[PDB]
């Protein structure tokens, strides 16, 4: 925690090189401790520290092994599970170990079963809400990780429905509403018996969260918009007061963070599309927030293409540009920036094709058949050919091809 505090206080996002020896000592200590005896509290504190200060340990596998050994212990709490899952999600960046994920899923299924068996007899609704909030947080962090059976777990948790009386924080309300909406969509697709109740509950929770009309973080706003969109798609029922409240919320929400990341540019583009279609459906446009996020992403669009033309444009950025070109409710400056970046991607792909055709004789293997090597070369060319073809189609769905020709 001390190192994390110092890193945060540092002007940039990383510490000085003088602490490389400290990090090396910590890595050696972790390597020794994994073999040595270790307790659940120490493991949780270590995971919290590694989440707080970005640090990939040298082993990174003995740690998850001991986490497997500890997750199914009888002393593990739902708060311990959500804490360790948050730490592992932050470390792995949506690439958490699926063995740990499934172990946590089985543990939370057992926990919700025990909670259903106990709380009904023991009730003290607010007192049981202390553990119910921990279970809800574990479910929401599991969903943020991206577990497969999240809709089923959410359905079981709502069958328990021990989190009533809106005693939870607004962020938890919105997250639970989004989880309920996703579970309702899956239940409608597979077994539509209980979909209606889940959809109605999620709609009511979103109404309760949005009636405050306060500005919210980017992630919370995007999740709320996604939940509202999926709820409207599945239920096809809305209220005039609700749409007025949502228009007020859209007007009152702004861009809290000006930090733009090419990692999250796809999420930003998806959020922009969702907000644009939602505003078009409602009938009231909220230009301010969408304009702010559009210019925030346009900054990176300009910087990547212009500052470093020789350096390869990110493929995620290229895909986001392709996804944002074909829409019709976006600004011409964004269209121009997307055209420029996709033109840079096209010229990079053509250069790659030329270099591959020049360096082909270095991959030919005499042991292969004449068709097998031909197929390998064909696919190596066809990946680029298909990428260029789809970029050409995306540009043909707009009128910036003249800008591309000019450049």
């Amino acid at each position: 925690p001390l190192l994390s505090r110092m890193r945060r206080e540092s002007p940039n996002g990383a510490l000085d090189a003088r602490f490389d020896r400290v990090f090396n000592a910590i890595d050696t200590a972790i390597g020794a401790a994994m073999r040595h005896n270790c307790t659940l509290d120490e493991l949780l504190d270590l995971a919290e520290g590694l989440a707080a200060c970005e640090m990939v340990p040298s082993a990174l596998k003995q740690v998850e092994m001991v986490l497997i050994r500890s997750v199914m212990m009888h002393e593990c709490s739902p708060m311990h599970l959500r804490r360790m899952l948050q730490a592992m999600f932050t470390l792995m960046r949506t690439s958490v170990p699926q063995v740990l994920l499934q172990s946590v899923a089985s543990r939370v299924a057992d926990y919700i079963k025990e909670a259903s068996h106990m709380d009904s007899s023991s009730s003290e609704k607010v007192k049981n809400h202390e553990e119910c909030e921990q279970l809800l947080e574990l479910l929401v962090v599991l969903g943020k990780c991206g577990y497969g059976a999240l809709p089923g777990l959410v359905t079981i948790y709502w069958e328990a429905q021990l989190i009533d009386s809106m005693q939870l924080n607004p962020r938890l309300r919105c997250s639970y509403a989004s989880l309920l909406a996703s579970a309702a969509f899956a239940l409608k697709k597979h077994d539509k018996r209980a979909w209606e109740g889940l959809a109605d509950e999620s709609h009511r929770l979103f109404m309760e969260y949005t009636r405050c009309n306060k500005e919210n973080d980017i992630g919370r706003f995007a999740e709320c918009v996604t939940g509202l969109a999926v709820l409207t798609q599945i239920k096809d029922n809305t209220n005039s007061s609700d749409v007025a409240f949502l228009k007020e919320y859209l007007s009152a929400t702004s861009l809290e963070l000006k930090s733009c990341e090419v990692i999250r540019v796809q999420e930003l583009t998806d959020l922009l599309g969702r907000t644009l279609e939602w505003s078009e459906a409602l009938g009231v446009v909220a230009p301010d927030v969408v304009i702010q996020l559009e210019k925030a992403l346009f900054v990176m669009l300009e910087n990547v293409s212009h500052t470093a033309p020789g350096v390869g444009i990110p493929d995620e950025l290229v895909t986001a540009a392709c996804c944002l070109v074909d829409m019709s409710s976006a600004s011409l400056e964004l269209r121009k920036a997307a055209a420029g970046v996709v033109g840079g991607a096209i010229v990079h792909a053509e250069e790659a094709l030329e270099t591959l055709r020049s360096g082909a004789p270095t991959q030919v293997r005499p042991g292969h058949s004449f068709d097998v090597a031909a197929l390998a070369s064909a696919e190596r060319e066809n990946v680029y050919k298909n990428s260029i073809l789809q970029y050409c189609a995306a540009l043909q769905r707009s009128g910036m091809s003249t800008h591309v020709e000019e450049l």
Binding site: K61, V71, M72, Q98, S106, D371, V372, L375, E379
Partner: protein
Amino acid sequence: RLAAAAVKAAEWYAAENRRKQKGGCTAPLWFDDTEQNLLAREQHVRSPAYRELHRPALTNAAMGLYGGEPGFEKAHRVWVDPDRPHIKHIYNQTALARNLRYARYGYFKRDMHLLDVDKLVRHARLLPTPGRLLTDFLYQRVPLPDKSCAALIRYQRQQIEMLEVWGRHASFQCAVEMFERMIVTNIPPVEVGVETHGEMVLCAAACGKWEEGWNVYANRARELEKESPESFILNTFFFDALLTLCVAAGRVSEGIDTLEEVIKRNLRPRGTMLNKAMILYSILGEQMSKHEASRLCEPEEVEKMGLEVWSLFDFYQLPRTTASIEAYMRMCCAFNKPTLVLKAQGFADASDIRLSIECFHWLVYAIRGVAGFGDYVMDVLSQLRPRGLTPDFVLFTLSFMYCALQRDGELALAIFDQHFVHQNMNPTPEMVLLFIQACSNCEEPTAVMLERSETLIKRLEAVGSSVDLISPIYDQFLELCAHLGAVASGFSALKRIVGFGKPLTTRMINSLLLANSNAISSNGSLSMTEELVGFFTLLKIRPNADTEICVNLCRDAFGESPVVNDFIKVIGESLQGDSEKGEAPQYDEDIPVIQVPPHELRQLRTEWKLSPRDIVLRRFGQHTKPPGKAALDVGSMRGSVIPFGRSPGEQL
């Protein structure tokens, strides 16, 4: 019903305990059949006579002063209990203190009257056959008790299970002859007890004779128990033997009845007994699944019974072992509960369980019908190495079975690329077929999949094989070539098929036609279409609806040759005639995917019943023919060793 029986027995035992306490306060709800035996052992080892007999050698100061006094110049005789030695390295290979020769049966014949037969069986060298052992005991005229009779029968059972499958009958006959001798020997006093009957049941189970074991020896033991009250009480060992016989013979109802009898008799079961019960429930569930596939306790009822057995495992405070984990995983796989399989694996890894490779076999087999677990499979394979385990052909076959079922292909390719190639093991035809099935049924196949399939086929042909999956393997390879557009590879596999001598199939020709249709870029044309279409007439192979679809696709891909058009007309007429004859058009049936449990996956290992302890301790009396005077002789050392010796060269 087992949980209800357990709670009823517990409450009845508590009521009886309270009644007898009032007549004459926490007490166990069950009865332990081993607590009195361990208590007797503890009292025996803590008795002063045992402590004085098994004591460390006297030191030099204890013996006397310095040396030279006869009788007090060496430590006195030291006796060691082999089961609980007070010293390390009981035996030694010194020159003057070799004691391995002093451990053979001939030396214990002198004290055979006080001898413990189980200790003799477990710790002795050059023992005779068990029949000769019993004959020698009777000749010495010693009063063999139940423990001695059971020890002799257990020695015979060890010999039986050591012997091969086709050599069990003679040993079983020897066992029954020994049993008859023990029964009919009135003098010296020889008693045949519950333990001896259980050991005979174990012999019958090891040989594989349910009719000879259940209806004879168990019946005799029960008759003795009912004839003599409390003099022939049935221990947990007898019912463990009964459950072993039930598992060996496949009897599930009898095993459940025996376990229920154990529960009702108000005595705690054993971990081995509960493992056997779970195995029997797994067998019942597998039989029920087979019957349903062909399409009578309810599946929900048998699932509940398995769950209540697993609950009883902790109800009786019985620790769970690796065998318990394997049995529970097998039962859950039979009942199709992959979530419970994963939960059981997590529980085992939690406190202390050395998970065996069979546990991961069951883990992979449980999720065969579940999607979104390729990353879990990869992580399991990666975690195999830190646990001291290595993947084998059975586990690779299970993984490729999962890949073929999920038709993902990319997972199978990654598994082969980053786990299998490092193993350098011979692939099996089932493994190769599953890999090719996954790589063909996947979406968006790649040329690397074709390269890997060709490599696997070449390696399989280079190595040996006994089973014959050549036709399905090449059919799936041709389907993969059809999906990829590898017309040249598909046509070249025909030479391999011809070399193997297998006949061509309409499905293979349809795959060739599809390859020609979807290989517009690489190669293929109307000439290829004609060459392929000349097979049905020449090879007298019946056409198909898939054949018609593929030939129409090839026509649209390349053009209109008159021969192709005539074939299309004649195949349309023939399909119409076949529809008139029957009711539905024929189609190319897909190749079934193997989904057999890992316990019947053609294990490539029979049995090795070897014992390193017996090999090192030289049981059965091995001999090495040591060198003689050659090592000892060194020549005359009157002078120094100089080159060419002291007298180089000599004339006689």
